[PDB]
């Protein structure tokens, strides 16, 4: 367990960042208490709730759809019969909860559990209803769900190593759609993004979490912000997260 200063990355943002590489155990920590504290993951569960759909076969490719009903949303790309591919790459909503609603609680929480995903805690599945956004809700959106920074990267490297039950079939399939250009072709970097705003605490939880393989070495990474500027989002954090691999894991 290595500590470390990212902080000229961070360009004055508060947050933290956590890199692991499980061959060799290093554990690289940029402010060690906000990676250790559980917040909503906000999208980055999609990551897991890709897993489980093709785990129940709701979905079974990257191809494949959920149903467009027709109706209307105000980003153009989700306003079509969009494919798990892009439905991943747009972080179209009502896809991912039509998909969650399709699987019974009790195997979501099955899964939760044996991946040890934070707290586990599915008990407000239908998420924050107070915001007024109704269906565009749930669990995993500043809800009941709540995870570490240390423990998604924990969940990612289980999930990518091979150490759980899901399908080798379906990592691969998560691998895919979650693979990012970042302009340096001797770098393989995969990952998503979460947006959240904590009401209470008056802070966002804007995330990146995912995987870099380097020549042999893999290392499975969460940065997170917690600031209080409504304007930093989990693109914004992904930014971050490219320039200290692109500093410090080149
Ligand atoms: C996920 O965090 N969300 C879905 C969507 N994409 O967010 S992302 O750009 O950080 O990946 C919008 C924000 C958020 C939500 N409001 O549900």
Redesign the pocket.
């Not at 998503?192 to 959240?196: D, R």
């Given at each position: 367990v290595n500590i470390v200063d990212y902080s000229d990355c961070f360009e004055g943002i508060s947050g933290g960042a956590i890199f692991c590489n499980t061959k060799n155990k290093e554990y690289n920590i940029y402010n060690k208490e906000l990676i250790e504290t559980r917040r909503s993951p906000?999208?980055?569960f999609?990551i897991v709730s890709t897993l489980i759909g093709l785990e129940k076969g709701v979905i079974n490719s990257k191809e494949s759809v959920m149903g467009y009903d027709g109706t209307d949303y105000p980003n153009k790309n989700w306003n079509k019969n969009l494919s798990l591919e892009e439905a991943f790459k747009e972080?179209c909503?009502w896809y991912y909860k039509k998909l969650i609603n399709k699987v019974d609680a009790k195997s979501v929480q099955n899964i939760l559990d044996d991946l040890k995903y934070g707290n586990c805690d599915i008990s407000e599945w239908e998420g924050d209803l107070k915001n007024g956004?109704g269906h565009?809700n749930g669990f995993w959106?500043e809800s009941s769900l709540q995870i570490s920074p240390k423990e998604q990267v924990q969940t990612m490297a289980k999930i990518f190593e091979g150490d759980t039950n899901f399908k080798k079939e379906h990592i691969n399939i998560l691998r895919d759609i979650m693979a990012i250009d970042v302009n340096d072709a001797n770098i393989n970097v995969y990952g998503?993004?979460?947006?959240?705003f904590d009401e209470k605490n008056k802070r966002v939880d804007?995330?990146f979490v995912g995987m870099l393989e380097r020549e042999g070495d893999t290392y499975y990474f969460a940065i997170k912000s917690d600031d209080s500027n409504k304007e930093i989002?989990?693109?914004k954090v992904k930014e971050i997260a490219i320039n200290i691999i692109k500093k410090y894991y080149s």
């Open positions: 906000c999208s980055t999609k972080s909503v956004k565009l959106l998503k993004t979460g947006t959240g804007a995330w989002t989990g693109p």
